[PDB]
Design a protein around this ligand. Structure first.
Ligand SMILES: *C(=O)[C@@H]([C@@H]1N=C(C(=O)O)[C@@H](S[C@@H]2CN[C@H](CNS(N)(=O)=O)C2)[C@@H]1C)[C@@H](C)O
Length: 267
């Protein structure tokens, strides 16, 4: 009933821009959920970078990597959209700066380097997600090839629900200890790419951490967030969208709107 009216609104919203919306929201205080197409598969785009940083911090926490070890890449041809790694090319970067660059600026060079050197590539990112008990998450290709968002292709996809559950386990749950979890949160809170998305759907004084993605094809874009309202339990929102035509552009306002409707369904 509270659920069916949110579903109506989302359905309207997806018809309005002539595409498809996936939502999954959790109130971690009360347990209440809301989903819409929350078990259907959606391209990840960059959004998986958020889990990559947590994979790295898991390795830090088990002392299989040091967060301050230098990572040198002086000879590499940096991928397009490496705004952060390009500037540090000569000096290298700390593993931790590199990971958070991956997350906070969606840096493709940061992404590819970490996956090649420390993570066992796409297969090993997928392995990290099975290990927390995400079974829907799949990664197949590398940073710049995973964006084709072709309807029906399952490469590089997850579901809204599965993303939410993962983020809940990683941000709020028990894979990371106190200390490392707070690093991970601070990383999410400093994400720079999501001002117009989930961040836009909540009051100004609520703290938000998020990771976005935009494929640039099939209007495909997404965002997921942990939300800390004033004097109340944290929320998880996970919003994924695709559009009918190859040439359609993403719509941030739709994401922000789908988020408002979702925060309202669990309120
Ligand atoms: C991943 O999807 C790609 C990479 N990451 C992006 C992202 O949104 O995470 C895209 S979009 C890009 C990020 N900064 C701008 C949006 N913020 S803003 N200027 O405040 O509107 C544009 C970017 C392409 C990668 C795989 O291409």
């Amino acid at each position: 009933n509270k659920s069916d009216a949110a579903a109506k609104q989302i359905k309207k919203l997806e018809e309005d821009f002539d595409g498809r919306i996936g939502v999954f929201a959790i109130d971690t205080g009360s347990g209440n959920t809301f989903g819409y197409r929350s078990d259907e598969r959606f391209p990840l785009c960059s959004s998986f970078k958020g889990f990559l940083a947590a994979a790295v911090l898991e390795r830090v926490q088990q002392k299989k990597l040091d967060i301050n070890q230098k990572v040198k890449y002086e000879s590499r041809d940096l991928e397009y959209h490496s705004p952060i790694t390009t500037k540090y090319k000569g000096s290298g970067m700390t593993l931790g700066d590199m990971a958070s660059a991956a997350l906070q600026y969606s840096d493709n060079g940061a992404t590819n380097i970490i996956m090649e050197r420390f993570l066992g590539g796409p297969e090993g990112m997928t392995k990290f997600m099975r290990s927390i008990g995400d079974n829907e998450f799949r990664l197949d290709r590398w940073a710049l090839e995973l964006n084709t968002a072709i309807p029906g292709d399952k490469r590089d996809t997850s579901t809204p629900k599965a993303v939410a559950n993962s983020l809940n386990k990683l941000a709020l749950g028990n894979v990371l200890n106190a200390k490392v979890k707070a690093i991970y949160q601070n990383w999410l809170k400093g994400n720079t790419t999501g001002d117009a998305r989930i961040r836009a759907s909540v009051p100004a004084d609520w703290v938000v951490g998020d990771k976005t993605g935009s494929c640039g094809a099939y209007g495909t874009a997404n965002d997921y967030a942990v939300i800390w309202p004033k004097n109340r339990a944290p929320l998880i929102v996970s919003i994924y969208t695709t559009r009918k035509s190859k040439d359609d552009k993403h719509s941030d306002k739709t994401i922000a709107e789908a988020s408002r409707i979702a925060i309202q369904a669990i309120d």
